[PDB]
Amino acid sequence: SLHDSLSVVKRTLESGNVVPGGGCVEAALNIYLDNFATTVGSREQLAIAEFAAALLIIPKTLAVNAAKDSSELVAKLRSY
């Protein structure tokens, strides 16, 4: 077990730059990119908005696989 635990912690530490998972990146980009879209006002505003929305498939899928109601788990992320 110690050999396993050291491998798990090492893998995390090996990456000099880390970003929180669990939907943090996708949910954060969803909101940030949605604001970005508002600076265009042409055609890319729609492509950016749909691109941003697409990233929510990850926290949505994770919630469904957890047997939890994605409509609350994902919505709460958008709020936070």
Partner: protein, 100 residues
């Protein structure tokens, strides 16, 4: 007729729908759960009016809707679809109004 019967008016040409849609998009920012998605869907559905007003008139609905959203965020709550020359403008000053 309505100019004499209804003293309480709001700007037309989608201007009223734009202000409601905006206030809904902001309201939903404080709502969590299933209600958030439905409120936003309502805010989106309201845009069917300025959308179809543009499309049926032969206008570039995508450009006009984008200009309406962005121009409205500046605080001018009477922006709407102009049918004289394809653009957006103050439909209250231009006397394009509907009873409240």
């Amino acid at each position: 007729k309505r100019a004499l019967q209804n003293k309480l008016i709001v700007a037309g040409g989608g201007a009223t729908e734009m202000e409601v849609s905006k206030c809904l998009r902001d309201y939903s920012k404080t709502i969590a759960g299933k209600q958030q998605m439905i409120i936003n869907a309502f805010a989106k559905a309201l845009e069917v009016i300025p959308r179809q007003l543009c499309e049926n008139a032969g206008f570039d609905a995508i450009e006009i809707l984008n200009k309406l959203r962005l121009a409205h965020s500046k605080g001018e709550k009477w922006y709407g679809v102009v049918f004289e020359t394809e653009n957006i403008g103050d439909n209250f000053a231009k006397f394009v109004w509907e009873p409240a």
